[PDB]
Amino acid sequence: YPQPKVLTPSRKDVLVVTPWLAPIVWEGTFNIDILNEQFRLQNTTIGLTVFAIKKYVAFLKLFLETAEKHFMVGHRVHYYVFTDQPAAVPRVTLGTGRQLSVLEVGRWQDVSMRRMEMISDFSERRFLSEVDYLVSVDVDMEFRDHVGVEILTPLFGTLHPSFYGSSREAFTYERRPQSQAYIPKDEGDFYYMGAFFGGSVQEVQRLTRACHQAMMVDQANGIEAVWHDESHLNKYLLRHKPTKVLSPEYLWDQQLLGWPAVLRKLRFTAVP
Amino acid sequence: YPQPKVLTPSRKDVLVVTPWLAPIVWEGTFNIDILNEQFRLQNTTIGLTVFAIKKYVAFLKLFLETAEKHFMVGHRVHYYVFTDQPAAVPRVTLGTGRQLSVLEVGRWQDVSMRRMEMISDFSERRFLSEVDYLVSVDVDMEFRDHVGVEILTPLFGTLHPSFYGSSREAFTYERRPQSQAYIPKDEGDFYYMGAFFGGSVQEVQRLTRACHQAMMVDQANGIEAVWHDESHLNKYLLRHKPTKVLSPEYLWDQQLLGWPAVLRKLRFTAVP
Ligand SMILES: O=c1ccn([C@@H]2O[C@H](COP(=O)(O)OP(=O)(O)O)[C@@H](O)[C@H]2O)c(=O)[nH]1
Ligand SMILES: O=c1ccn([C@@H]2O[C@H](COP(=O)(O)OP(=O)(O)O)[C@@H](O)[C@H]2O)c(=O)[nH]1
Numbered sequence: 001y002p003q004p005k006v007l008t009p010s011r012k013d014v015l016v017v018t019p020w021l022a023p024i025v026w027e028g029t030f031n032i033d034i035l036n037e038q039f040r041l042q043n044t045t046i047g048l049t050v051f052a053i054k055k056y057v058a059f060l061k062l063f064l065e066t067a068e069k070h071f072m073v074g075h076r077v078h079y080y081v082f083t084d085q086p087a088a089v090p091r092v093t094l095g096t097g098r099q100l101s102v103l104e105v106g107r108w109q110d111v112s113m114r115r116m117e118m119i120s121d122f123s124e125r126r127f128l129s130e131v132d133y134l135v136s137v138d139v140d141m142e143f144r145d146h147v148g149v150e151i152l153t154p155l156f157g158t159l160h161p162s163f164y165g166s167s168r169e170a171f172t173y174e175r176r177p178q179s180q181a182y183i184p185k186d187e188g189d190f191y192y193m194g195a196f197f198g199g200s201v202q203e204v205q206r207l208t209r210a211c212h213q214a215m216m217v218d219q220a221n222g223i224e225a226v227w228h229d230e231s232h233l234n235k236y237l238l239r240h241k242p243t244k245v246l247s248p249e250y251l252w253d254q255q256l257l258g259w260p261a262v263l264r265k266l267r268f269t270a271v272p
Numbered sequence: 273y274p275q276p277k278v279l280t281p282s283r284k285d286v287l288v289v290t291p292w293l294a295p296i297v298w299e300g301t302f303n304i305d306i307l308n309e310q311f312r313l314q315n316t317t318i319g320l321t322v323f324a325i326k327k328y329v330a331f332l333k334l335f336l337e338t339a340e341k342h343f344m345v346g347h348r349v350h351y352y353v354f355t356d357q358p359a360a361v362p363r364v365t366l367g368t369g370r371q372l373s374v375l376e377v378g379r380w381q382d383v384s385m386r387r388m389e390m391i392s393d394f395s396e397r398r399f400l401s402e403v404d405y406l407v408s409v410d411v412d413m414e415f416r417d418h419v420g421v422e423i424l425t426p427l428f429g430t431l432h433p434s435f436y437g438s439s440r441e442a443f444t445y446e447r448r449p450q451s452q453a454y455i456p457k458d459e460g461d462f463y464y465m466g467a468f469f470g471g472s473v474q475e476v477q478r479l480t481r482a483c484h485q486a487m488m489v490d491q492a493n494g495i496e497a498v499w500h501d502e503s504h505l506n507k508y509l510l511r512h513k514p515t516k517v518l519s520p521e522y523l524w525d526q527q528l529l530g531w532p533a534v535l536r537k538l539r540f541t542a543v544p
Contacts, residue, residue, distance in 0.1 A: 001291070003439065003440045003460065003461070004287060004290055004291050004461055004462065005287060006286060006287050006296075006431065006437065006462075007285065007286060007287070007436075007437060007534065008287060009281050009283060009284060009285070009286065009287060009288065010287055010288075010289060010291075011281060012284065013279065013281070014278060014279060014281065015276060015278050015279070015280060015281060016281065016282075016288060016289050017282060017288050017295050017301055018276055019273070019276050019282075019301075019302055019303035019306060020302065020303065020306045020307060020310065021295040021297070021301065021302050021307070021422065021516070023289050023293040023295065024278075025293070029289055029291075029293065030291055030292065030293050031291035031292065034291060034292045034513070035292060035293070038292065038513070150293065159278065164278045164279075165278065165279060167275065168275045188275065189275070189276055190276065190278075241306070241310070244293070262279065
């Protein structure tokens, strides 16, 4: 493979490492053949969690067919579909070493807390025996390009595609000191999107347990953070900084935002 | 602290991440206040090993006085001085939470294998109960600027200051297939210097055990790698890629190489 070049930046146009030295994952920053090897040597299994409740079951067929084409291909994958409609999960043919489980789910407050509470419950009992990493994403999405082991790390979040260019003042953090998710006006590294985060099983157990326990405190006090579990994810990732950050290549909406020059690939995008 | 800037590279002139997403540590890539916090929260202790054999005891006074001014200040440090002359170790006053132990050492083949064999022995029995990370450096050096927790990671090596600009063909890797340290002409990421490497205790136990066991094989076969334990360190770090790489700011010789523009700081330098 090509020799890395010490006196040429892998990118001239974007930050590729955070000020706490976590990589920011853009095309042109990684050699996938090296990463695939390192992860295959550990026989890595990736768990992918997705919620498909009420009408969202309609997004599963394309989400799964495209995941089969672009997500962790060559590695072991276990999809966990959380749904209120097990009979509406489509039977998608899977590649070798890939499996899918359906987890049936049973008041808008529990609906707001559902993702973090359910991942926390299942992460303890046990995603922990079944996978090495857990990745949580939204279901109204499709994979268009490679999303692979470059993202794997103890803890990651993803730059929200509407905010990667913004000053922190513009970030839609929870701004009321009465909320657990409160971030003051002068703090904040990045604005992470709730639609794509993950990490090792242990770090995901920690994060979801924290967010779930924080949301319950908010509820008991009659406040709901401006962007619900996303507000709390952002507070969590401020205090416990992610070990990689994914660029917006990993979470994009082409209808809303087009295809700007700093994105060399659009890997995982909103469905219209 | 300042908000990271997504659309501005932390550096426009150098690579700051390897193609396996390990940071390459240059000035302007890290915020030390954030890193100091994360490491203090874990009460991190860093072990620093240095050999001072025969006339090299003469380098210890300046090496230690300058380490006190610039190495891991604010964190716990344990110096381990390996020497054939315990009475020639100078009594240098140490800052709080810092300690020094003298380890007395007892045929040019064992001399060649000494660093890796001795660190491996002591790393097992036990640096392992005393520190969280181990850093190994040469003693004929002085600290001139900050060398701190930005370097800490499971496994690191440092770019040799004579080779960071070179194509791999120019790297003085061991080139004879009869050596354990053999690297072919078309392989190699970087040329790491034997004078500054480290990592977690476990990863240093592994690396030194590997290099020691490889050198013995070479000896039994009547070959000595062109650059001795450095040749083997380079073979090791090719097959087990470091999780951070330090730039040549961390290992420089101003007499030989001057002060080029890509070095914003000269942190740890050769003594004339
Ligand atoms: O009735 C619902 C509402 C939400 N969701 C899940 O939670 C995510 C967040 O929903 P939303 O579309 O509101 O997020 P947005 O992309 O519009 O900000 C969805 O992708 C689904 O995975 C669901 O399954 N059923
Ligand atoms: O007689 C010796 C030879 C070597 N060393 C140690 O091993 C390192 C490597 O020595 P050398 O000066 O040859 O390395 P160089 O910087 O010249 O490449 C030295 O810094 C010392 O720490 C020592 O203590 N006594």
